[PDB]
Write a protein that binds this ligand. Structure first.
Ligand SMILES: [Mg+2]
Ligand SMILES: [Mg+2]
Ligand SMILES: [Mg+2]
Ligand SMILES: [Mg+2]
Ligand SMILES: [Mg+2]
Ligand SMILES: [Mg+2]
Ligand SMILES: [Mg+2]
Ligand SMILES: [Mg+2]
Ligand SMILES: [Mg+2]
Ligand SMILES: [Mg+2]
Ligand SMILES: [Mg+2]
Ligand SMILES: [Mg+2]
Ligand SMILES: [Mg+2]
Ligand SMILES: [Mg+2]
Ligand SMILES: [Mg+2]
Ligand SMILES: [Mg+2]
Ligand SMILES: [Mg+2]
Ligand SMILES: [Mg+2]
Ligand SMILES: [Mg+2]
Ligand SMILES: [Mg+2]
Ligand SMILES: [Mg+2]
Ligand SMILES: [Mg+2]
Ligand SMILES: [Mg+2]
Ligand SMILES: [Mg+2]
Ligand SMILES: [Mg+2]
Ligand SMILES: [Mg+2]
Ligand SMILES: [Mg+2]
Ligand SMILES: [Mg+2]
Ligand SMILES: [Mg+2]
Ligand SMILES: [Mg+2]
Ligand SMILES: [Mg+2]
Ligand SMILES: [Mg+2]
Ligand SMILES: [Mg+2]
Ligand SMILES: [Mg+2]
Ligand SMILES: [Mg+2]
Ligand SMILES: [Mg+2]
Ligand SMILES: [Mg+2]
Ligand SMILES: [Mg+2]
Ligand SMILES: [Mg+2]
Ligand SMILES: [Mg+2]
Ligand SMILES: [Mg+2]
Ligand SMILES: [Mg+2]
Ligand SMILES: [Mg+2]
Ligand SMILES: [Mg+2]
Ligand SMILES: [Mg+2]
Ligand SMILES: [Mg+2]
Ligand SMILES: [Mg+2]
Ligand SMILES: [Mg+2]
Ligand SMILES: [Mg+2]
Ligand SMILES: [Mg+2]
Ligand SMILES: [Mg+2]
Ligand SMILES: [Mg+2]
Ligand SMILES: [Mg+2]
Ligand SMILES: [Mg+2]
Ligand SMILES: [Mg+2]
Ligand SMILES: [Mg+2]
Ligand SMILES: [Mg+2]
Ligand SMILES: [Mg+2]
Ligand SMILES: [Mg+2]
Ligand SMILES: [Mg+2]
Ligand SMILES: [Mg+2]
Ligand SMILES: [Mg+2]
Ligand SMILES: [Mg+2]
Ligand SMILES: [Mg+2]
Ligand SMILES: [Mg+2]
Ligand SMILES: [Mg+2]
Ligand SMILES: [Mg+2]
Ligand SMILES: [Mg+2]
Ligand SMILES: [Mg+2]
Ligand SMILES: [Mg+2]
Ligand SMILES: [Mg+2]
Ligand SMILES: [Mg+2]
Ligand SMILES: [Mg+2]
Ligand SMILES: [Mg+2]
Ligand SMILES: [Mg+2]
Ligand SMILES: [Mg+2]
Ligand SMILES: [Mg+2]
Ligand SMILES: [Mg+2]
Ligand SMILES: [Mg+2]
Ligand SMILES: [Mg+2]
Ligand SMILES: [Mg+2]
Ligand SMILES: [Mg+2]
Ligand SMILES: [Mg+2]
Ligand SMILES: [Mg+2]
Ligand SMILES: [Mg+2]
Ligand SMILES: [Mg+2]
Ligand SMILES: [Mg+2]
Ligand SMILES: [Mg+2]
Ligand SMILES: [Mg+2]
Ligand SMILES: [Mg+2]
Ligand SMILES: [Mg+2]
Ligand SMILES: [Mg+2]
Ligand SMILES: [Mg+2]
Ligand SMILES: [Mg+2]
Ligand SMILES: [Mg+2]
Ligand SMILES: [Mg+2]
Ligand SMILES: [Mg+2]
Ligand SMILES: [Mg+2]
Ligand SMILES: [Mg+2]
Ligand SMILES: [Mg+2]
Ligand SMILES: [Mg+2]
Ligand SMILES: [Mg+2]
Ligand SMILES: [Mg+2]
Ligand SMILES: [Mg+2]
Ligand SMILES: [Mg+2]
Ligand SMILES: [Mg+2]
Ligand SMILES: [Mg+2]
Ligand SMILES: [Mg+2]
Ligand SMILES: [Mg+2]
Ligand SMILES: [Mg+2]
Ligand SMILES: [Mg+2]
Ligand SMILES: [Mg+2]
Ligand SMILES: [Mg+2]
Ligand SMILES: [Mg+2]
Ligand SMILES: [Mg+2]
Ligand SMILES: [Mg+2]
Ligand SMILES: [Mg+2]
Ligand SMILES: [Mg+2]
Ligand SMILES: [Mg+2]
Ligand SMILES: [Mg+2]
Ligand SMILES: [Mg+2]
Ligand SMILES: [Mg+2]
Ligand SMILES: [Mg+2]
Ligand SMILES: [Mg+2]
Ligand SMILES: [Mg+2]
Ligand SMILES: [Mg+2]
Ligand SMILES: [Mg+2]
Ligand SMILES: [Mg+2]
Ligand SMILES: [Mg+2]
Ligand SMILES: [Mg+2]
Ligand SMILES: [Mg+2]
Ligand SMILES: [Mg+2]
Ligand SMILES: [Mg+2]
Ligand SMILES: [Mg+2]
Ligand SMILES: [Mg+2]
Ligand SMILES: [Mg+2]
Ligand SMILES: [Mg+2]
Ligand SMILES: [Mg+2]
Ligand SMILES: [Mg+2]
Ligand SMILES: [Mg+2]
Ligand SMILES: [Mg+2]
Ligand SMILES: [Mg+2]
Ligand SMILES: [Mg+2]
Ligand SMILES: [Mg+2]
Ligand SMILES: [Mg+2]
Ligand SMILES: [Mg+2]
Ligand SMILES: [Mg+2]
Ligand SMILES: [Mg+2]
Ligand SMILES: [Mg+2]
Ligand SMILES: [Mg+2]
Ligand SMILES: [Mg+2]
Ligand SMILES: [Mg+2]
Ligand SMILES: [Mg+2]
Ligand SMILES: [Mg+2]
Ligand SMILES: [Mg+2]
Ligand SMILES: [Mg+2]
Ligand SMILES: [Mg+2]
Ligand SMILES: [Mg+2]
Ligand SMILES: [Mg+2]
Ligand SMILES: [Mg+2]
Ligand SMILES: [Mg+2]
Ligand SMILES: [Mg+2]
Ligand SMILES: [Mg+2]
Ligand SMILES: [Mg+2]
Ligand SMILES: [Mg+2]
Ligand SMILES: [Mg+2]
Ligand SMILES: [Mg+2]
Ligand SMILES: [Mg+2]
Ligand SMILES: [Mg+2]
Ligand SMILES: [Mg+2]
Ligand SMILES: [Mg+2]
Ligand SMILES: [Mg+2]
Ligand SMILES: [Mg+2]
Ligand SMILES: [Mg+2]
Ligand SMILES: [Mg+2]
Ligand SMILES: [Mg+2]
Ligand SMILES: [Mg+2]
Ligand SMILES: [Mg+2]
Ligand SMILES: [Mg+2]
Ligand SMILES: [Mg+2]
Ligand SMILES: [Mg+2]
Ligand SMILES: [Mg+2]
Ligand SMILES: [Mg+2]
Ligand SMILES: [Mg+2]
Ligand SMILES: [Mg+2]
Ligand SMILES: [Mg+2]
Ligand SMILES: [Mg+2]
Ligand SMILES: [Mg+2]
Ligand SMILES: [Mg+2]
Ligand SMILES: [Mg+2]
Ligand SMILES: [Mg+2]
Ligand SMILES: [Mg+2]
Ligand SMILES: [Mg+2]
Ligand SMILES: [Mg+2]
Ligand SMILES: [Mg+2]
Ligand SMILES: [Mg+2]
Ligand SMILES: [Mg+2]
Ligand SMILES: [Mg+2]
Ligand SMILES: [Mg+2]
Ligand SMILES: [Mg+2]
Ligand SMILES: [Mg+2]
Ligand SMILES: [Mg+2]
Ligand SMILES: [Mg+2]
Ligand SMILES: [Mg+2]
Ligand SMILES: [Mg+2]
Ligand SMILES: [Mg+2]
Ligand SMILES: [Mg+2]
Ligand SMILES: [Mg+2]
Ligand SMILES: [Mg+2]
Ligand SMILES: [Mg+2]
Ligand SMILES: [Mg+2]
Ligand SMILES: [Mg+2]
Ligand SMILES: [Mg+2]
Ligand SMILES: [Mg+2]
Ligand SMILES: [Mg+2]
Ligand SMILES: [Mg+2]
Ligand SMILES: [Mg+2]
Ligand SMILES: [Mg+2]
Ligand SMILES: [Mg+2]
Ligand SMILES: [Mg+2]
Ligand SMILES: [Mg+2]
Ligand SMILES: [Mg+2]
Ligand SMILES: [Mg+2]
Ligand SMILES: [Mg+2]
Ligand SMILES: [Mg+2]
Ligand SMILES: [Mg+2]
Ligand SMILES: [Mg+2]
Ligand SMILES: [Mg+2]
Ligand SMILES: [Mg+2]
Ligand SMILES: [Mg+2]
Ligand SMILES: [Mg+2]
Ligand SMILES: [Mg+2]
Ligand SMILES: [Mg+2]
Ligand SMILES: [Mg+2]
Ligand SMILES: [Mg+2]
Ligand SMILES: [Mg+2]
Ligand SMILES: [Mg+2]
Ligand SMILES: [Mg+2]
Ligand SMILES: [Mg+2]
Ligand SMILES: [Mg+2]
Ligand SMILES: [Mg+2]
Ligand SMILES: [Mg+2]
Ligand SMILES: [Mg+2]
Ligand SMILES: [Mg+2]
Ligand SMILES: [Mg+2]
Ligand SMILES: [Mg+2]
Ligand SMILES: [Mg+2]
Ligand SMILES: [Mg+2]
Ligand SMILES: [Mg+2]
Ligand SMILES: [Mg+2]
Ligand SMILES: [Mg+2]
Ligand SMILES: [Mg+2]
Ligand SMILES: [Mg+2]
Ligand SMILES: [Mg+2]
Ligand SMILES: [Mg+2]
Ligand SMILES: [Mg+2]
Ligand SMILES: [Mg+2]
Ligand SMILES: [Mg+2]
Ligand SMILES: [Mg+2]
Ligand SMILES: [Mg+2]
Ligand SMILES: [Mg+2]
Lengths: 59, 110, 141, 77, 200
RNA sequence: CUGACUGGGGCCUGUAGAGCACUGAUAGGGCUAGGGGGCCCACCAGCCUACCAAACCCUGUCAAACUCCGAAGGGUCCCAGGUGGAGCCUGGGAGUGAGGGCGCGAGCGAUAACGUCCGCGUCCGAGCGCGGGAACAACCGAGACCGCCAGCUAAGGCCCCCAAGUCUGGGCUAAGUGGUAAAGGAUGUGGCGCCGCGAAGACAGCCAGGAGGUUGGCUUAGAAGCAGCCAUCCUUUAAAGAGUGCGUAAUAGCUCACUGGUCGAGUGGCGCCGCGCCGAAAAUGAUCGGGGCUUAAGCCCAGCGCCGAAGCUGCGGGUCUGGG
RNA sequence: CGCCUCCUAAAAGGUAACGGAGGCGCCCAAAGGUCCCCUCAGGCGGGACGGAAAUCCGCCGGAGAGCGCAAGGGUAGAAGG
RNA sequence: CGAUCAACGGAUAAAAGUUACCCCGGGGAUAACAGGCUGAUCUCCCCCGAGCGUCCACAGCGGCGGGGAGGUUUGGCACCUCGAUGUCGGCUCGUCGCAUCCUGGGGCUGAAGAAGGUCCCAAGGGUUGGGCUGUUCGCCCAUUAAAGCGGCACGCGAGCUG
RNA sequence: UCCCCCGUGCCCAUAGCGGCGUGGAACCACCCGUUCCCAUUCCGAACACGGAAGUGAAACGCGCCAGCGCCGAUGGUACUGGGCGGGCGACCGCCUGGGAGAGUAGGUCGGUGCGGGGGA
């Protein structure tokens, strides 16, 4: 179970903890995608800023 | 609704709870006197002794001395030396005191 | 008018007018009732007018049922002073009312007289008003 | 017109300093309270001002006994 | 005397969605069963404005079940004065506490003086079986002056019913009426300022 | 790999909401000392209390300093994930300790401040650099290493000023509302219900009647239907209240309702929702930024593209760090 | 203008105003320590002077008592006497 | 052991004020003038109608109570100006808003008629001379078609006045 | 290792209050005494002691009765973490998740641990 993550919006003006989640996922630029293994320890990260991001399901 | 009897049985055993030692439980009826030692942590009684179960006849003072002298032996046979003495609501006098001397002369440590 | 004879404290904070009324939303006293809509602090100086006008309209009979009470003391500083130097002095006793409250219930009075009697309060009160008859929903709770 | 208020006492930093499952050492303070809002359990030392400290080096665990109040227990690992 | 209605079941719908579409959500239950249902409002207000909890309402499920029911509680919206939830009891031969309305007959004596008849309890809590249900309870109020107290101990009961409250409850009273000449003296005195409680 | 941060897990907790179990508030009600009043004595109580009302109860309510209850959240530890101008022990070098706008809660204020003081966050400060927004530090979009007369989008726009639709589909507005506001008033109008009345002929218009006890009474000086009220009951009826408004010093009178006819089908009144009218008067010359748009160039729902930022990709190379 | 308690204070800590509220600058030789002994305020009924309320008794009765002093916290299965 | 070193993290064991004779260095961080924001207050307007108005809820009136505009009153905060923004009153010069004092056109009238109270549209002109005092205001004098209220830094000292 | 029974823990009213019945052989409890030990801020009340004729009337134990109290869902709703809008404002809506309290349905006249007496 893998998930290709694609950022949709910029993190400007949003609280700092959400920025720390974006850094935990390793998002330093816009539109960058990354396929990550599906575990709740990483899914709970994306659940926070889900409104700024998009996720695709792979394998 | 509590009474002075239940309060006196409560307060002294509350004092004994901080000791954590093996408690010498005393129950004195009009006919007999009963004593079984329990572990307050795990709620398991070690051994028992009394006068009715030992088929005693008359005066509960010397009879209580007898039940002490009969209780302490099994304690020295199971390896129980350091102990405490709880009186409950009864005053430390007469029958219960003669029982205490029965245990101390029986070989316990209190 | 209305004011408590004794109180624990003479001053209170303003709180918040958020949410709907937690009680007094269904008619349980009289045939008809008046429900308020807008939130506001309701002074006894505002209540006495509606009450007095309604009993001046009845002139006998019927019963006025007040379901609220002015438990909120209102404060104000003296005129032409600076911010600070203590909190303003308490000059009135008001009541918090939010959407859903039924302040007044009336019985022993027929529909029409109830209609105009409840109509005077619509103007003599600052909040929007709505006239209700006690139906099965007010009887149910 | 003047003020009669504005006077107050400093805060006492009241609460519990060690939670359930944490590592403690002999003498480390556990709880601060006024009166008996807690009651000492196993290996729970307490002084005169109701300061609860660690009696031994162990792990922390809490329980509520209902009418007898909440108790703490410091287990040997 | 007796009323009927039609209902349908609901499993995976938003209660706000159905409630906006006009389908009031609900859950019917008794000591033997439990189910989630929904009933339309425009067909609910017409029947409920007449027999709220005083009469019987049997519901018809989509499969064809006809169950004699009685609404136990109604959760009204605290803003719009529109019901946002309902509870439905499922009846049987077992007796249970319910409510019944009171019909007050007779012209009171105090009313003829322009008085006011306050009705504390137009409904009474009484335990009875659904088969022994009376539609209401008749009480004579023609001997009411200004003013004496009437209570629940004065009730005459049709056979088979059991009063579920203490008889000391006052069900009605006659209250002093308003007056213009009372307002002149109502302002004839000043009430004392609130005497605060001395702290410490 | 110990970090901000994410998941499992146990613990710590008492504000929003909630409620009477304590302390207070408490309108009405039921009970009952107590008195006040009043029949009734100095002869001592008794009885009535449409009198305020102790205690206790009921119906319905309130509280930052009330709590029989109590989350979302907050913290901490355990372990896993997670490797980043992340974290940590020691050493040297500072700058600041005038903040500000906004958002969420609260107070102070006057449910005022381009007001102030607090906790949390963002941002401006230091990003007056960039697109919007007419320009405008903090509203929305977006963090600029620079070089391309290339490409895609965010906010926002797509009638001209000005790049992109006078693009389609439904429905709404007639007030240029749009394009500054209220309690309130309204034959404004559109979308859903509820109804009754009416060819056991309604509403509109057209044709008769609309009477008596009785100038009723508490009743005072007139009160004759037409002043308040502790009266509203009836008679003859196709129909008539002991009277809707107008009218009199009372009268007198006209008329509403009303029943019948006349014409032959819809009518009128309550409750919800969209958008509008009056409410709306101030000082240098006008105005939504303008020009000007009414099956819109406006409001609502609903689609397929495009424009467009220094935001992301292609491509040309600087430099700090990292793998080789 | 130093200190304590309430809340403001937004369920850890903490958090300011000239915000809303009361207290302190003393005392106890036992009112400290240890053993043992014991439970209230309040409502129903009785009773010398003598009681709304002096003391005692009978029934109910979890903390509404009280613990030098404001406040909260705590509390008789005592910390109270 | 000496603490109202009670300004309580405590200068020294020794300590009030006055300054229109004032100076230096500063502040728009910080009052007085001015604008700004607020409209607490003040001005003006509208809601509902008890009642007065002989009768008659509105001819005019409008208890208790409620919704707002204007930024002309006093104040609130101290936001640009203290390397200055000259403070009240008067003289002069105009222009501007109508909540209109007169004049024009009107509804209502408790309008016989004259005169008039109240409500409507309307800024075009007009809106006199003086005693008092610094006065703005205001009382009074003789008139008047009337002798209006407000804006422009409570307009106007790089125009005077002082 | 089955019943009843004597202590003694735990769970912390699902365990209390009230009302009804019931059990003395053992036990247990009242009871018989106040000389002895001790005791009464008076009192053999309780406490203490020596006993064993009487006694289930009390209390206690064992069971029924749900009047009161206790416990309490299904929901929906309140509030709110995160994400969004409207409204001049007071404040109001939508998405994601958590989800009360009150009431309603009804459940409760206890459950169990060890050691001890007799019974089976
Ligand atoms: Mg994209
Ligand atoms: Mg932003
Ligand atoms: Mg966090
Ligand atoms: Mg956060
Ligand atoms: Mg960062
Ligand atoms: Mg960076
Ligand atoms: Mg991966
Ligand atoms: Mg998992
Ligand atoms: Mg999950
Ligand atoms: Mg999932
Ligand atoms: Mg989480
Ligand atoms: Mg997911
Ligand atoms: Mg999302
Ligand atoms: Mg208890
Ligand atoms: Mg031996
Ligand atoms: Mg040892
Ligand atoms: Mg008064
Ligand atoms: Mg409220
Ligand atoms: Mg309620
Ligand atoms: Mg207000
Ligand atoms: Mg007010
Ligand atoms: Mg007033
Ligand atoms: Mg007012
Ligand atoms: Mg003054
Ligand atoms: Mg004054
Ligand atoms: Mg001054
Ligand atoms: Mg006042
Ligand atoms: Mg005032
Ligand atoms: Mg006031
Ligand atoms: Mg007042
Ligand atoms: Mg009636
Ligand atoms: Mg009717
Ligand atoms: Mg309306
Ligand atoms: Mg209604
Ligand atoms: Mg003052
Ligand atoms: Mg003064
Ligand atoms: Mg003075
Ligand atoms: Mg002081
Ligand atoms: Mg003072
Ligand atoms: Mg003082
Ligand atoms: Mg004082
Ligand atoms: Mg504090
Ligand atoms: Mg400290
Ligand atoms: Mg536990
Ligand atoms: Mg628990
Ligand atoms: Mg306890
Ligand atoms: Mg354990
Ligand atoms: Mg374990
Ligand atoms: Mg291990
Ligand atoms: Mg809807
Ligand atoms: Mg609909
Ligand atoms: Mg029954
Ligand atoms: Mg009078
Ligand atoms: Mg009265
Ligand atoms: Mg009088
Ligand atoms: Mg008055
Ligand atoms: Mg008088
Ligand atoms: Mg008078
Ligand atoms: Mg009075
Ligand atoms: Mg007087
Ligand atoms: Mg006066
Ligand atoms: Mg006063
Ligand atoms: Mg005073
Ligand atoms: Mg005092
Ligand atoms: Mg005193
Ligand atoms: Mg006192
Ligand atoms: Mg670690
Ligand atoms: Mg942080
Ligand atoms: Mg940091
Ligand atoms: Mg963390
Ligand atoms: Mg794990
Ligand atoms: Mg677990
Ligand atoms: Mg009272
Ligand atoms: Mg009187
Ligand atoms: Mg009660
Ligand atoms: Mg929970
Ligand atoms: Mg958590
Ligand atoms: Mg935090
Ligand atoms: Mg910590
Ligand atoms: Mg572990
Ligand atoms: Mg470990
Ligand atoms: Mg790793
Ligand atoms: Mg690396
Ligand atoms: Mg590294
Ligand atoms: Mg590094
Ligand atoms: Mg660094
Ligand atoms: Mg470092
Ligand atoms: Mg470290
Ligand atoms: Mg070194
Ligand atoms: Mg360092
Ligand atoms: Mg340093
Ligand atoms: Mg400063
Ligand atoms: Mg500052
Ligand atoms: Mg700051
Ligand atoms: Mg700030
Ligand atoms: Mg703010
Ligand atoms: Mg946001
Ligand atoms: Mg926030
Ligand atoms: Mg005010
Ligand atoms: Mg407010
Ligand atoms: Mg404002
Ligand atoms: Mg504000
Ligand atoms: Mg502010
Ligand atoms: Mg801050
Ligand atoms: Mg937060
Ligand atoms: Mg930045
Ligand atoms: Mg910019
Ligand atoms: Mg804008
Ligand atoms: Mg604009
Ligand atoms: Mg906005
Ligand atoms: Mg702005
Ligand atoms: Mg070129
Ligand atoms: Mg993009
Ligand atoms: Mg445009
Ligand atoms: Mg252009
Ligand atoms: Mg451009
Ligand atoms: Mg408009
Ligand atoms: Mg405007
Ligand atoms: Mg405006
Ligand atoms: Mg707008
Ligand atoms: Mg509006
Ligand atoms: Mg209207
Ligand atoms: Mg006929
Ligand atoms: Mg005929
Ligand atoms: Mg709609
Ligand atoms: Mg509307
Ligand atoms: Mg509108
Ligand atoms: Mg306009
Ligand atoms: Mg205007
Ligand atoms: Mg217009
Ligand atoms: Mg203009
Ligand atoms: Mg304009
Ligand atoms: Mg435009
Ligand atoms: Mg719409
Ligand atoms: Mg679209
Ligand atoms: Mg196309
Ligand atoms: Mg580029
Ligand atoms: Mg770039
Ligand atoms: Mg290609
Ligand atoms: Mg290169
Ligand atoms: Mg190189
Ligand atoms: Mg390095
Ligand atoms: Mg490496
Ligand atoms: Mg390699
Ligand atoms: Mg200081
Ligand atoms: Mg606090
Ligand atoms: Mg800490
Ligand atoms: Mg720390
Ligand atoms: Mg801090
Ligand atoms: Mg500060
Ligand atoms: Mg002193
Ligand atoms: Mg003491
Ligand atoms: Mg006593
Ligand atoms: Mg104290
Ligand atoms: Mg205290
Ligand atoms: Mg204890
Ligand atoms: Mg000295
Ligand atoms: Mg000295
Ligand atoms: Mg000195
Ligand atoms: Mg000094
Ligand atoms: Mg001093
Ligand atoms: Mg000094
Ligand atoms: Mg000195
Ligand atoms: Mg001096
Ligand atoms: Mg001095
Ligand atoms: Mg001086
Ligand atoms: Mg001088
Ligand atoms: Mg001078
Ligand atoms: Mg001077
Ligand atoms: Mg000189
Ligand atoms: Mg000089
Ligand atoms: Mg000189
Ligand atoms: Mg100088
Ligand atoms: Mg200063
Ligand atoms: Mg000054
Ligand atoms: Mg100052
Ligand atoms: Mg001066
Ligand atoms: Mg001055
Ligand atoms: Mg001043
Ligand atoms: Mg100024
Ligand atoms: Mg201006
Ligand atoms: Mg000003
Ligand atoms: Mg403005
Ligand atoms: Mg205003
Ligand atoms: Mg304004
Ligand atoms: Mg007017
Ligand atoms: Mg009148
Ligand atoms: Mg009149
Ligand atoms: Mg007149
Ligand atoms: Mg007026
Ligand atoms: Mg008056
Ligand atoms: Mg007025
Ligand atoms: Mg007023
Ligand atoms: Mg007003
Ligand atoms: Mg007002
Ligand atoms: Mg207003
Ligand atoms: Mg304006
Ligand atoms: Mg002026
Ligand atoms: Mg002036
Ligand atoms: Mg003046
Ligand atoms: Mg003044
Ligand atoms: Mg001034
Ligand atoms: Mg400032
Ligand atoms: Mg200069
Ligand atoms: Mg100057
Ligand atoms: Mg000069
Ligand atoms: Mg000057
Ligand atoms: Mg001056
Ligand atoms: Mg002046
Ligand atoms: Mg002059
Ligand atoms: Mg001159
Ligand atoms: Mg001039
Ligand atoms: Mg002029
Ligand atoms: Mg104009
Ligand atoms: Mg006018
Ligand atoms: Mg005129
Ligand atoms: Mg004219
Ligand atoms: Mg005229
Ligand atoms: Mg004239
Ligand atoms: Mg006049
Ligand atoms: Mg002019
Ligand atoms: Mg003009
Ligand atoms: Mg012109
Ligand atoms: Mg001219
Ligand atoms: Mg001119
Ligand atoms: Mg002129
Ligand atoms: Mg002039
Ligand atoms: Mg002149
Ligand atoms: Mg002036
Ligand atoms: Mg002038
Ligand atoms: Mg002049
Ligand atoms: Mg003056
Ligand atoms: Mg004069
Ligand atoms: Mg004179
Ligand atoms: Mg003269
Ligand atoms: Mg003259
Ligand atoms: Mg003149
Ligand atoms: Mg002028
Ligand atoms: Mg001015
Ligand atoms: Mg001048
Ligand atoms: Mg001079
Ligand atoms: Mg001079
Ligand atoms: Mg066997
Ligand atoms: Mg069996
Ligand atoms: Mg256990
Ligand atoms: Mg069970
Ligand atoms: Mg109980
Ligand atoms: Mg019994
Ligand atoms: Mg009861
Ligand atoms: Mg529970
Ligand atoms: Mg979070
Ligand atoms: Mg709207
Ligand atoms: Mg604004
Ligand atoms: Mg409001
Ligand atoms: Mg979770
Ligand atoms: Mg209840
Ligand atoms: Mg059962
Ligand atoms: Mg048991
Ligand atoms: Mg259990
Ligand atoms: Mg057991
Ligand atoms: Mg056996």
């Amino acid at each position: 179970p893998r998930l290709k993550v694609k950022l949709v919006k910029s993190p400007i003006g949003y609280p700092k903890d959400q920025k720390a989640a974006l850094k935990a996922l390793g998002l330093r630029r816009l539109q960058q995608e990354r396929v990550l293994e599906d575990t709740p320890a990483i899914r709970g990260n994306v659940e926070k800023v889900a409104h700024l991001v998009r996720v695709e399901v792979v394998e | 609704r509590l009474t002075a009897y239940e309060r006196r049985k409560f307060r002294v055993r509350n004092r004994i709870k901080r000791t954590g030692r093996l408690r010498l439980s005393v129950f004195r009826s009009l006919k007999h006197i009963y004593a079984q030692i329990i572990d307050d942590e795990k709620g398991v009684t070690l051994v028992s002794a009394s006068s009715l179960a030992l088929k005693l006849k008359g005066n509960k003072t010397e009879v209580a001395r007898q039940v002490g002298r009969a209780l302490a032996e099994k304690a020295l046979a199971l390896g129980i030396k350091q102990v405490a003495f709880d009186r409950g609501p009864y005053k430390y006098h007469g029958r219960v005191k003669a029982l205490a001397e029965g245990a101390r002369e029986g070989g316990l440590e209190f | 008018m209305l004011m408590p004879r004794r109180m624990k404290y003479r001053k209170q904070q303003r709180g918040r007018l958020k949410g709907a009324t937690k009680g007094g939303d269904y008619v349980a006293f009289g045939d008809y009732g008046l429900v308020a809509l807008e939130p506001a602090w309701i002074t006894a100086q505002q209540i006495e007018a509606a009450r007095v006008a309604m009993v001046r309209h009845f002139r006998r009979g019927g019963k006025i049922f007040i379901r609220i009470f002015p438990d909120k003391p209102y404060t104000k500083k003296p005129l032409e002073v600076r911010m600070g130097k203590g909190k303003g002095n308490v000059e009135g006793y008001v009541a918090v009312v939010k959407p859903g409250r039924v302040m007044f219930e009336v019985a022993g009075v027929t529909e029409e007289q109830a209609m105009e009697a409840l109509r005077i309060a619509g103007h003599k009160l600052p909040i929007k008003t709505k006239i209700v008859r006690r139906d099965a929903y007010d009887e149910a709770q | 017109g003047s003020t009669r208020n504005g006077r107050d006492s400093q805060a006492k930093r009241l609460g519990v300093k060690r939670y359930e499952g944490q590592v403690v050492r002999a003498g480390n303070i556990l709880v601060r309270q006024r009166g008996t809002r807690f009651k000492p359990g196993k290996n729970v030392g307490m002084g005169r001002d109701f300061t609860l400290f660690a009696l031994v080096d162990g792990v922390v665990e809490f329980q509520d006994r209902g009418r007898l109040g909440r108790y703490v227990h410091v287990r040997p690992l | 005397m007796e009323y009927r209605l039609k209902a349908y079941y609901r499993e995976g719908e938003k209660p706000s969605a159905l409630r906006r579409a006009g389908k009031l959500p609900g859950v019917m239950y008794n000591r033997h069963l439990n189910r989630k249902v929904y009933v339309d409002l425009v067909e609910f207000d017409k029947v409920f404005r007449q027999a709220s909890i005083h009469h019987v309402i049997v519901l018809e499920l989509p499969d064809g079940q006809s169950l004699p029911t009685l609404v136990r509680q109604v959760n009204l919206d605290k803003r719009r004065r529109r019901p946002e939830h309902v509870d439905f009891f499922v009846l049987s031969d077992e007796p249970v506490e319910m409510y019944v309305p009171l019909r007050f007959v007779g012209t009171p004596a105090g009313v003829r003086a322009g008085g006011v008849l306050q009705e504390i309890h137009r409904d009474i809590l009484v335990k009875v079986s659904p088969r022994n249900i009376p539609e209401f309870i008749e009480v004579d109020v023609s001997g009411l002056e200004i003013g004496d107290s009437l209570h629940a101990s004065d009730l005459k009961l049709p056979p088979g019913v059991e009063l579920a409250v203490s008889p000391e409850e006052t069900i009605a009273a006659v209250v002093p009426p308003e007056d213009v000449e009372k307002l002149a003296e109502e302002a004839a005195a000043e009430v004392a300022e609130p005497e605060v409680i001395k702290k410490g």
